[PDB]
Amino acid sequence: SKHTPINLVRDLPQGFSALEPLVDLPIGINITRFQTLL
Amino acid sequence: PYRVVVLSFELLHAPATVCGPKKSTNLVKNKCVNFNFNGLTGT
Structure with a gap:
């Protein structure tokens, strides 16, 4: 993982x-597939 | 009556999690020593 500030x-x-x-x-x-949570 | 408790030993094909402890001895400096840091063996 990594985080960064952006103004774009x-x-x-x-x-x-x-x-x-x-x-x-x-x-x-x-594991074969995935899906995010939102 | 005689209560009986049985611990079951199971080793499936997967990475292990819980097992016997490993003793970490004193840390010596300024000497020729055969060391082992979390499995990394060297002299």
Whole structure:
């Protein structure tokens, strides 16, 4: 994960940023699809 | 009567979570030592 401030609209910001690890969970289950919650 | 409690040992094909503790000894400095930091073995 990574967070960054932006003052832009309707476009992916131009820049470079790295995503640090957050938590490792070894559930050991198979996954094929996903969907967010909103 | 004689109450009986049985602990079951199960090892399925998946990453493990709970198991025996590992003792971490003292931390020495300024000496040649064979060390082991969370599984990383070296000298």
